Design a protein around this nucleic acid. Structure first.
Lengths: 87, 112, 86
DNA sequence: CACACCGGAAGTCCTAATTAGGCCAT
DNA sequence: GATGGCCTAATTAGGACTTCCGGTGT
């Protein structure tokens, strides 16, 4: 019919296909992050978001008043601890 | 009603003598070779309006297939890949978060 | 047609206490959901925190990043932040 | 030094799922 | 205030590739 299946309904559970997963984490990471913005923007509220890829990196967004959460030393410290905590 | 997919493309472009100079087989298990890459991809681009296509690009598409198990790469044989299994592949509640033991709302003041 | 359906809006501060607070709500629900799905769909750690104009601090956080908001430490870090002068 | 390959990341394209603004109710 | 929901219209993704490349191997 069309040139592409379009968007497909997905099962709300952890995805095992490493690629499919990594992909979705990209697409979705891109968006929630967009959301963190518009909200904080549109409404003028403080917002903090932080996503950590299963590869290691830590993508994040923050509104002025919250920067420290990830800027300050007390914070970055806490984040490391957390993310490094045993599985 | 396109639905054109690379691997498939390379079975219309790999079953026509026309481009026997750029794309040709090898072995009978499905293996093959891209003698004139840049052009193969030149053909590709035309398809799927990608006038800026090229091997450094079209290559990657293939590289994924590696894991997607559709086409692997032969050690050495530069420009020589192969379809994994041939010739078979021929065919011719919004608030869920609130109740997840992760959510938590409150107030600033309550923070003493 | 009955209702105009989702209307496009300038991506800038909504200057209408009613519309703004209502938006902050709806959008707070979606983004939270998103966080939850992102994390469960990809088993990745994720932490979201949203403070309402009214003072309500809402928060989502995956197991490993829970200490970010439940520890006395971080609990105080959030206090420090959200209380800084405009 | 060149050149294929390797792969990570993040960005089109087309569509078909999902959100989210006006408004009224809770 | 903060949400629930309807009626629709905006935005997101899923899949399947594309775009940038900085590392390797040969």
């Amino acid at each position: 019919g069309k040139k592409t299946r379009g968007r497909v309904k997905i099962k709300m559970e952890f995805i095992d296909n490493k690629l499919r997963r990594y992909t979705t984490f990209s697409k979705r990471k891109t968006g929630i992050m967009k959301k963190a913005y518009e909200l904080s923007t549109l409404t003028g509220t403080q917002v903090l978001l932080l996503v950590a890829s299963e590869t290691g990196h830590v993508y994040t967004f923050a509104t002025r008043k919250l920067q420290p959460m990830i800027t300050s030393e007390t914070g970055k410290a806490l984040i490391q601890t957390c993310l490094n905590s045993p599985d | 009603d396109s639905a054109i997919t690379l691997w498939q493309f390379l079975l219309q472009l790999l079953q026509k003598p026309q481009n026997k100079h750029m794309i040709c087989w090898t072995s009978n298990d499905g293996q093959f070779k891209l003698l004139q890459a840049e052009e193969v991809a030149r053909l590709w681009g035309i398809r799927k309006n990608k006038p800026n296509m090229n091997y450094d690009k079209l290559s990657r598409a293939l590289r994924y297939y590696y894991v997607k198990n559709i086409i692997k790469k032969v050690n050495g044989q530069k420009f020589v890949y192969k379809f994994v299994s041939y010739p078979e592949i021929l065919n011719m509640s919004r608030n869920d978060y609130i109740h997840s033991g992760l959510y938590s709302s409150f107030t600033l003041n309550s923070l003493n």
